[PDB]
Amino acid sequence: GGSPDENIAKFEKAYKKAEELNQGELMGRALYNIGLEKNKMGKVKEAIEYFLRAKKVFDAEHDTDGARRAAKSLSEAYQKVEGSGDKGKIFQKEGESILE
């Protein structure tokens, strides 16, 4: 297995590991990943929460990149809050994992 909401259960543990270390870059990315999992399951409004909280922690770190990155995924979500998906081919893909 490895369902997105079940992956969140691990990412919340990983968030607590980020949080005890107080490393808001990691704390932001943790909630951001959770939000991506929500968004792909159709939990758009739940995705918003996690991208807002992720972004908020990036804003504290002054990492404007991750703040805009969470806001970009927020834009992806807000389109589905206005026109929920819509009958059309949205060119989606996997999360940018260029982590060597």
Side-chain angles (χ1 to χ4, degrees), residues 11 13-33 53-54 56-63:
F11 296 149
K13 179 189 298 181
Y15 175 62
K16 284 285 163 287
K17 190 171 190 58
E19 185 183 79
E20 62 181 78
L21 298 177
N22 299 142
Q23 302 187 92
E25 59 175 280
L26 291 170
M27 299 164 66
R29 296 173 199 139
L31 299 176
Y32 177 64
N33 293 330
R53 300 167 194 199
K56 179 181 60 183
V57 184
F58 288 124
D59 291 310
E61 302 297 271
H62 303 124
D63 180 57

Side-chain angles (χ1 to χ4, degrees), residues 9-81:
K10 178 179 176 181
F11 296 149
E12 294 175 279
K13 179 189 298 181
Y15 175 62
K16 284 285 163 287
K17 190 171 190 58
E19 185 183 79
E20 62 181 78
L21 298 177
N22 299 142
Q23 302 187 92
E25 59 175 280
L26 291 170
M27 299 164 66
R29 296 173 199 139
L31 299 176
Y32 177 64
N33 293 330
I34 295 175
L36 296 175
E37 305 307 279
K38 292 296 186 182
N39 185 29
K40 68 186 62 169
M41 295 182 299
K43 296 180 167 298
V44 176
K45 284 61 178 300
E46 296 177 54
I48 297 173
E49 295 301 280
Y50 286 107
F51 297 142
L52 280 174
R53 300 167 194 199
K55 180 183 179 303
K56 179 181 60 183
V57 184
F58 288 124
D59 291 310
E61 302 297 271
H62 303 124
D63 180 57
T64 179
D65 183 80
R68 289 172 59 173
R69 187 183 299 239
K72 188 71 276 177
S73 304
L74 274 170
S75 183
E76 222 290 278
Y78 293 148
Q79 294 174 90
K80 302 171 182 174
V81 183

